[PDB]
Amino acid sequence: YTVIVLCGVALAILVGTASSAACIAKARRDCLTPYALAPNATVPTALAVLC
Amino acid sequence: FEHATTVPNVPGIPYKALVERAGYAPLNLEITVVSSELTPSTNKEYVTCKFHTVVPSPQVKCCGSLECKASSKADYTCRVFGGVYPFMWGGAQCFCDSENTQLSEAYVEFAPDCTIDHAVALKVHTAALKVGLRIVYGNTTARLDTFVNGVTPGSSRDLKVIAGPISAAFSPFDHKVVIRKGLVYNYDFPEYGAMNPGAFGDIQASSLDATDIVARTDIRLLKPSVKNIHVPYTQAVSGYEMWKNNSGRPLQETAPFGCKIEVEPLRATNCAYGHIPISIDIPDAAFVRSSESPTILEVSCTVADCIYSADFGGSLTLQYKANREGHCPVHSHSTTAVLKEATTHVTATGSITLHFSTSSPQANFIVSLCGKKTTCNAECKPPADHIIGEPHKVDQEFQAAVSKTSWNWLLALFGGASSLIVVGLIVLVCSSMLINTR
Amino acid sequence: FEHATTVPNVPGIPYKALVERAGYAPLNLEITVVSSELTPSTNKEYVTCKFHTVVPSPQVKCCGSLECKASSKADYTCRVFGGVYPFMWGGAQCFCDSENTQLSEAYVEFAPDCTIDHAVALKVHTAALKVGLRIVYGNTTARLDTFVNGVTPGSSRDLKVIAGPISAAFSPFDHKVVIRKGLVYNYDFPEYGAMNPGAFGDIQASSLDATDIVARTDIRLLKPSVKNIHVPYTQAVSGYEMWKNNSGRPLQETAPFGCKIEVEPLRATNCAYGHIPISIDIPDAAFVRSSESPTILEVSCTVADCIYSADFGGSLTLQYKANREGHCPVHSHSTTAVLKEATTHVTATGSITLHFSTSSPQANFIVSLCGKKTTCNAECKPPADHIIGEPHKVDQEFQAAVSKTSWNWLLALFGGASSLIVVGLIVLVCSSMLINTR
Ligand SMILES: *[C@@H]1O[C@H](CO)[C@@H](O)[C@H](O)[C@H]1NC(C)=O
Numbered sequence: 001y002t003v004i005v006l007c008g009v010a011l012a013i014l015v016g017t018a019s020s021a022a023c024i025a026k027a028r029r030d031c032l033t034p035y036a037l038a039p040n041a042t043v044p045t046a047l048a049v050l051c
Numbered sequence: 052f053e054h055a056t057t058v059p060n061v062p063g064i065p066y067k068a069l070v071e072r073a074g075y076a077p078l079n080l081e082i083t084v085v086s087s088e089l090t091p092s093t094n095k096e097y098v099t100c101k102f103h104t105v106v107p108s109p110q111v112k113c114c115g116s117l118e119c120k121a122s123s124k125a126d127y128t129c130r131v132f133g134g135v136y137p138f139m140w141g142g143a144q145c146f147c148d149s150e151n152t153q154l155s156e157a158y159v160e161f162a163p164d165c166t167i168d169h170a171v172a173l174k175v176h177t178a179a180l181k182v183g184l185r186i187v188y189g190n191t192t193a194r195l196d197t198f199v200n201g202v203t204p205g206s207s208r209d210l211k212v213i214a215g216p217i218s219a220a221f222s223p224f225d226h227k228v229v230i231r232k233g234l235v236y237n238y239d240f241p242e243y244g245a246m247n248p249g250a251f252g253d254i255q256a257s258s259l260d261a262t263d264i265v266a267r268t269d270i271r272l273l274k275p276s277v278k279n280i281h282v283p284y285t286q287a288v289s290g291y292e293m294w295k296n297n298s299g300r301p302l303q304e305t306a307p308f309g310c311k312i313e314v315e316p317l318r319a320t321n322c323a324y325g326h327i328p329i330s331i332d333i334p335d336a337a338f339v340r341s342s343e344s345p346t347i348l349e350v351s352c353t354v355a356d357c358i359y360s361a362d363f364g365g366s367l368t369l370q371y372k373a374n375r376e377g378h379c380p381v382h383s384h385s386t387t388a389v390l391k392e393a394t395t396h397v398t399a400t401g402s403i404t405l406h407f408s409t410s411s412p413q414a415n416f417i418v419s420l421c422g423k424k425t426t427c428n429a430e431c432k433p434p435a436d437h438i439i440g441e442p443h444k445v446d447q448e449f450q451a452a453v454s455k456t457s458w459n460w461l462l463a464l465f466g467g468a469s470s471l472i473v474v475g476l477i478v479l480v481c482s483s484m485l486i487n488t489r
Numbered sequence: 490f491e492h493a494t495t496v497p498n499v500p501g502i503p504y505k506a507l508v509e510r511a512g513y514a515p516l517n518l519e520i521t522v523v524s525s526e527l528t529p530s531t532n533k534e535y536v537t538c539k540f541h542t543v544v545p546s547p548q549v550k551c552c553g554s555l556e557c558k559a560s561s562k563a564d565y566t567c568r569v570f571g572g573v574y575p576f577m578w579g580g581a582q583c584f585c586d587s588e589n590t591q592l593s594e595a596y597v598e599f600a601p602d603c604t605i606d607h608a609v610a611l612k613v614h615t616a617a618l619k620v621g622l623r624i625v626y627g628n629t630t631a632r633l634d635t636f637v638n639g640v641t642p643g644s645s646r647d648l649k650v651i652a653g654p655i656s657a658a659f660s661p662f663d664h665k666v667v668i669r670k671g672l673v674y675n676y677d678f679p680e681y682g683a684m685n686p687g688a689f690g691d692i693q694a695s696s697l698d699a700t701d702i703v704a705r706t707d708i709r710l711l712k713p714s715v716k717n718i719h720v721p722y723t724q725a726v727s728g729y730e731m732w733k734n735n736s737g738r739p740l741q742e743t744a745p746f747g748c749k750i751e752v753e754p755l756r757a758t759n760c761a762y763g764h765i766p767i768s769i770d771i772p773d774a775a776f777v778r779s780s781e782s783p784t785i786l787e788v789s790c791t792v793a794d795c796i797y798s799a800d801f802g803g804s805l806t807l808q809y810k811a812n813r814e815g816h817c818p819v820h821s822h823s824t825t826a827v828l829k830e831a832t833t834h835v836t837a838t839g840s841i842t843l844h845f846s847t848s849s850p851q852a853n854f855i856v857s858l859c860g861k862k863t864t865c866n867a868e869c870k871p872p873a874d875h876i877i878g879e880p881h882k883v884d885q886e887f888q889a890a891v892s893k894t895s896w897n898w899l900l901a902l903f904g905g906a907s908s909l910i911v912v913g914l915i916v917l918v919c920s921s922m923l924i925n926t927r
């Protein structure tokens with residue numbers, strides 16, 4: 001029984017980390033999706049959040 | 052008042068319960084299963100044992116002709132022989148060159164010692180179980196012995212108690228059984244009227260002293276080939292002896308749950324499987340009004356030390372404040388932990404120590420002192436000694452072995468990553484709205 | 490040689506079969522089930538009968554005090570009463586103004602005539618079936634009686650014959666039965682130890698003459714209320730009498746398949762249901778080489794008239810040409826029809842009739858005369874009478890009631906529209922090609 005709980009915990013944490021990484025990467029891409037070269041940076045706070 | 056319970060069907064494990072009714076102080080109720088008795092219904096099929104081949108004096112019809120004749124004795128085998136020439140210590144018993152003939156017959160019967168060495172085959176069905184209960188209430192003891200079936204009552208010592216059918220049925224006996232010299236064996240004995248030489252049940256009889264016997268054991272005669280008179284017989288080895296040699300272990304060393312099997316009723320006793328639903332009716336007279344019962348105030352727990360031991364080894368202390376001298380009950384309504392004593396004296400401000408047992412390390416529960424309740428918790432450690440044969444697991448484990456620390460670790464590890472992906476989608480739609488604004 | 494068959498378990502319906510061996514003329518084999526015998530295993534639960542209330546003289550104490558005392562008698566009831574003042578024809582039996590006290594007790598015992606009116610409750614199980622078979626082969630008759638189980642060959646002439654097992658188990662008896670004065674009733678009697686007033690089995694005893702009895706019948710005493718001395722008792726009406734009044738019809742008039750139920754063994758007899766597979770072993774010496782068997786030539790059927798009757802009413806004739814005088818067997822391998830005699834004398838050019846029965850209006854089949862076969866057919870008509878109580882349906886109907894004319898009408902019934910649609914498709918493709926050429 002004890003082996004199952006650890007494996008399930010590892011699976012859950014891995015799935016959560018992967019989902020969070022994918023979500024944050026997609027959010028960064030959407031924020032960076034516009035080329036933004038014609039004007040300056042929309043807001044430096046958004047740039048800081050991005051990186 | 053009628054009050055029901057489910058009690059484990061295991062000897063020497065008292066069960067404590069209460070009875071709640073407005074206006075009357077709680078009354079302790081102790082139930083003990085003194086000993087079980089599973090007696091099945093059986094019918095005698097037949098009896099077999101070592102046999103003995105009779106060899107009656109051969110008939111001689113000499114210088115003549117003779118013919119074989121059948122009979123009614125079991126396994127009767129007959130045969131004539133011509134050209135024989137009997138001789139005896141006196142000399143030639145007749146006078147003719149091979150014209151004589153001799154008739155030889157053989158049959159079988161159970162040996163005298165069988166009168167005590169018999170092995171009888173039985174067919175069993177519809178196992179029934181009887182339970183002896185001892186009940187204690189209001190420091191008064193009552194007896195009863197009832198069949199676990201619910202239609203039958205048991206009235207004893209002012210009380211009539213009705214049992215309920217076992218939850219899960221146990222029946223160590225198989226459809227076929229053999230009993231011999233006080234030993235029970237699980238074996239598929241041949242059906243009556245089916246004889247196979249060199250195997251159990253080669254000789255069969257309805258009763259030990261039944262004049263009628265049916266049996267075939269492959270007896271074949273041989274033509275005399277010696278000077279003197281002698282009937283040579285040949286037969287297979289006795290089946291009963293062969294079964295005795297390799298009968299295997301008896302049922303005492305194989306019955307599950309350690310059922311002590313006695314012979315003269317052919318019944319098992321003192322062995323545990325399943326639970327008994329049992330309803331107790333209690334006279335209203337035995338109950339006591341709460342008005343005269345002691346009144347308690349400001350009850351408090353304290354766990355000096357508790358050991359997660361198989362044997363009852365946990366300790367506890369209670370401090371109360373009351374006004375009336377008397378006796379009050381005590382109980383632990385949490386099934387995980389079981390107390391030791393039910394009733395205790397009560398003083399104005401006295402404290403009393405209690406003993407208990409638990410099956411989980413996180414020993415937390417609510418204890419009822421007299422008419423009032425009190426929650427309390429503590430942690431117990433495993434014991435040094437890990438093998439002991441005294442009453443253990445008064446309550447079966449309920450996945451409560453998980454301590455609060457383990458739960459805390461498991462909960463803390465998990466994080467809201469689903470919320471994180473939801474926030475990712477939210478910021479995606481927000482970025483879409485931002486593009487709209489742009 | 491060993492030869493197997495399936496026979497309908499039903500008395501008075503002979504079954505004819507053959508055994509085929511190269512170089513041996515066919516041997517008839519007739520099997521008859523003389524009488525069925527179904528005996529189940531039973532145990533004695535208890536016995537009951539009309540009871541009788543014992544009203545022993547009341548214990549009177551003059552100018553004193555007295556108390557009740559319990560006893561071991563079944564249904565024992567006690568009660569004391571103060572203020573008694575018994576009187577008799579002589580006068581007062583005590584002299585003090587209400588100090589005296591009278592104790593009255595009561596118990597119940599089975600009535601004497603019970604010895605013959607007793608009703609016994611039984612539990613039955615594991616029905617076992619016994620068959621009596623009579624087998625005729627080569628104008629030699631033999632008998633046997635065997636358990637239906639196919640593992641206990643019967644003994645007859647030191648011959649082993651195996652029967653069964655039954656295709657579908659049948660037992661008119663229920664789990665719980667009761668028996669009284671030669672009549673069996675199907676009833677759900679209360680289990681031993683459970684007494685209900687005004688119902689069957691209120692008085693229960695292990696044996697008729699058992700000193701130990703357990704029973705309750707709601708006996709309540711009444712305070713004395715008349716000048717003289719008496720112990721007024723009130724009790725519910727006897728349960729056994731009430732059960733007798735409305736017991737319902739016995740099992741003799743409800744058992745399916747017309748089973749005759751005898752009491753002493755408590756077993757059913759002479760009643761038919763299901764099929765029996767049976768294997769018969771015949772000694773080789775019984776067989777006769779075909780060399781000595783009569784030789785037949787140019788066999789021919791002729792159905793003078795056939796009646797589609799329940800009984801054996803169909804007629805047939807056979808014309809044969811042979812060379813050797815003797816007896817030849819005759820049979821009908823078609824299950825739909827069964828002949829009357831198995832063998833007949835054979836002459837050089839004789840012709841002989843035969844009586845047969847059939848279960849269809851179209852009576853066509855192959856009849857084997859001695860070693861040779863002969864097909865032949867005829868049409869039978871229904872009989873004038875339509876209700877008789879003689880062995881009927883020696884062969885069960887096999888949806889063969891359809892007549893040849895009915896089959897011809899069915900054949901003329903169907904119509905081939907599939908050909909029409911196929912022609913339509915063919916002309917469709919051809920006309921599509923033509924339209925392309927248009
Ligand atoms: C049982 O407990 C009650 C409660 O106080 C007490 O009055 C009674 O005397 C006790 N009975 C015995 C036999 O000690």
Ligand SMILES: *[C@@H]1O[C@H](CO)[C@@H](O)[C@H](O)[C@H]1NC(C)=O
Pocket residue numbers: 627628815816
């Ligand atoms: C039985 O039939 C055979 C064959 O014809 C015959 O030889 C024999 O005599 C018959 N036995 C009896 C007893 O009729």
